[PDB]
Amino acid sequence: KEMPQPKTFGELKNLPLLNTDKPVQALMKIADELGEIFKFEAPGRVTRYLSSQRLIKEACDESRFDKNLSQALKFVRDFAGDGLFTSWTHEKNWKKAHNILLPSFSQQAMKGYHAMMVDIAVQLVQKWERLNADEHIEVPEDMTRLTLDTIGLCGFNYRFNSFYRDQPHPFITSMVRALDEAMNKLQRANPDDPAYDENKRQFQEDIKVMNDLVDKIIADRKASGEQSDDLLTHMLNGKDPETGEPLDDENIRYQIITFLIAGHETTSGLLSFALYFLVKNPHVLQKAAEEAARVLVDPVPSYKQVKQLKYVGMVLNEALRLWPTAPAFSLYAKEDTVLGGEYPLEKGDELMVLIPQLHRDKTIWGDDVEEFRPERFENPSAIPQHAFKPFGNGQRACIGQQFALHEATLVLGMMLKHFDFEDHTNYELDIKETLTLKPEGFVVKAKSKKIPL
Numbered sequence: 381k382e383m384p385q386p387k388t389f390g391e392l393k394n395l396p397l398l399n400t401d402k403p404v405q406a407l408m409k410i411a412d413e414l415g416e417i418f419k420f421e422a423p424g425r426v427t428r429y430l431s432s433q434r435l436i437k438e439a440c441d442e443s444r445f446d447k448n449l450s451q452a453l454k455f456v457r458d459f460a461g462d463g464l465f466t467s468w469t470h471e472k473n474w475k476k477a478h479n480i481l482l483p484s485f486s487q488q489a490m491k492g493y494h495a496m497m498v499d500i501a502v503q504l505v506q507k508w509e510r511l512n513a514d515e516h517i518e519v520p521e522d523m524t525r526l527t528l529d530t531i532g533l534c535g536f537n538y539r540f541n542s543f544y545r546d547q548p549h550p551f552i553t554s555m556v557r558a559l560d561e562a563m564n565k566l567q568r569a570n571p572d573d574p575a576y577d578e579n580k581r582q583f584q585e586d587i588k589v590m591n592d593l594v595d596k597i598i599a600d601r602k603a604s605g606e607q608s609d610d611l612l613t614h615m616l617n618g619k620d621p622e623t624g625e626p627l628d629d630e631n632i633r634y635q636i637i638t639f640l641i642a643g644h645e646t647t648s649g650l651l652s653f654a655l656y657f658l659v660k661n662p663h664v665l666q667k668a669a670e671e672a673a674r675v676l677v678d679p680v681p682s683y684k685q686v687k688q689l690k691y692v693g694m695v696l697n698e699a700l701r702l703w704p705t706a707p708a709f710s711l712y713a714k715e716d717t718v719l720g721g722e723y724p725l726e727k728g729d730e731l732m733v734l735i736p737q738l739h740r741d742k743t744i745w746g747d748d749v750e751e752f753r754p755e756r757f758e759n760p761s762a763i764p765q766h767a768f769k770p771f772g773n774g775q776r777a778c779i780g781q782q783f784a785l786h787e788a789t790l791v792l793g794m795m796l797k798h799f800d801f802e803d804h805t806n807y808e809l810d811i812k813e814t815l816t817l818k819p820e821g822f823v824v825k826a827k828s829k830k831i832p833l
């Protein structure tokens with residue numbers, strides 16, 4: 381049949397609909413109006429936005445569809461290169477890096493990172509214990525300090541020392557400005573008016589800053605023979621069991637840059653949304669706080685204790701349901717195929733999965749999809765295949781999922797053990813869109829339960 385399409389702007393087709401500060405939220409409203417699938421046309425390109433589990437369960441069939449690099453990922457590839465996130469599945473360096481790194485990101489590998497994660501989580505708790513009575517917490521700012529420092533220390537034994545600064549690390553200044561330039565180029569019609577030579581100049585300088593610190597990190601480690609159990613040691617020593625080859629130093633740099641992007645606001649967003657929903661749902665906060673107090677009986681949490689924070693895990697899954705912090709991914713058709721018995725696609729045709737809309741499919745979740753209810757995840761096995769996809773799909777799924785959830789469960793556990801929280805401004809959710817999503821200006825007050833560390 382005829383696929384629905386949103387409003388057009390003459391020869392510009394649908395392109396101006398993404399000339400907005402909040403394109404994901406705009407696409408969600410278009411999905412609300414048009415339903416499970418809509419065509420999006422621009423001069424020279426056509427994609428289809430999927431919102432229903434019924435169609436997304438077919439999109440997630442790896443025999444029929446593979447990961448596409450969206451324009452967003454193609455612009456990020458200028459500095460993330462052939463790292464896992466910005467590689468095609470058919471690139472030799474994708475399969476090598478995947479085989480070498482995947483065992484180092486397992487639930488079981490988190491035992492080795494736990495001590496380092498505790499180091500940064502304790503720095504967060506001590507910061508909040510040390511605030512004066514009249515002061516508040518800038519939640520996304522503090523969560524980003526935690527997640528960046530955690531990936532720096534577990535990733536390559538580097539301390540960003542985010543709790544010791546207002547001003548970002550020079551690497552982060554360049555990474556954030558490079559990510560901004562990549563996202564800004566999406567809505568940039570003609571990028572060659574002489575105003576955009578200065579953007580392009582700044583872009584090349586930020587790439588050089590990122591390449592220089594990371595190449596130096598790798599070079600320093602190769603020299604010292606120092607064997608830290610971090611991802612960088614794993615990458616310098618590891619061999620792909622298929623090819624028998626290791627990663628080269630350039631590819632290792634791209635992997636580190638990719639991990640630092642991922643571990644920044646994409647991961648801290650989960651913690652910012654989780655705390656937002658907890659302060660807006662005080663009975664849910666109380667239930668999560670009762671679990672944290674019952675389970676976290678030692679001054680520092682153990683790996684086994686974090687694994688026993690079941691309700692805190694449910695809280696984080698329910699935050700990922702409503703506001704997944706990497707809210708879309710792109711696929712292409714491996715062969716001519718028919719989607720949902722109705723939508724014929726040619727080989728190469730592109731799909732975009734709109735994850736926030738998938739997570740609001742009433743046929744899966746029931747009518748009250750806007751409610752924050754962690755009890756939806758009492759038994760995560762009960763969720764049908766391809767209904768809950770905040771970490772993407774199949775062999776191209778998030779490699780960091782167990783790392784992100786261990787980090788988030790540990791620190792949210794400790795926060796709920798150590799503090800009562802107040803929504804002292806009655807904060808109005810305002811979701812800022814970058815490469816990720818965050819509750820912009822989210823602030824709370826934390827009152828110590830005066831429990832020692």
Ligand code: MNH
Pocket residue numbers: 447464465466478531638639640642643646647650704705706708709710769770771772773775776777778779780781783784
């Ligand atoms: C919450 C936190 C969080 C979310 C919601 C998340 C979401 C995603 C989604 C969705 C994809 C699939 C993208 C696509 O185009 O299909 C993906 C791919 C990826 N992610 Mn993770 N990601 C992390 C944290 C997250 N990632 C962390 C932390 C790391 C590493 C330290 C990480 C490293 C990756 C890598 C690497 C890939 C690419 C995997 C592959 O294609 O082989 N990540």
Ligand SMILES: CC(C)C1=CC2=CC[C@@H]3[C@](C)(CCC[C@@]3(C)C(=O)N[C@@H](Cc3c[nH]c4ccccc34)C(=O)O)[C@H]2CC1
Pocket residue numbers: 398403404407425427449450451452453456566567706707708709732814815816
């Ligand atoms: C780096 C990772 C984390 C990201 C992945 C993304 C995937 C989908 C993106 C994204 C959410 C940013 C907003 C545009 C959107 C929804 C998209 O459809 N974009 C399509 C369609 C599109 C929009 N503008 C374009 C300009 C040219 C070509 C295509 C487009 C695309 O990027 O391809 C974006 C966030 C950043």
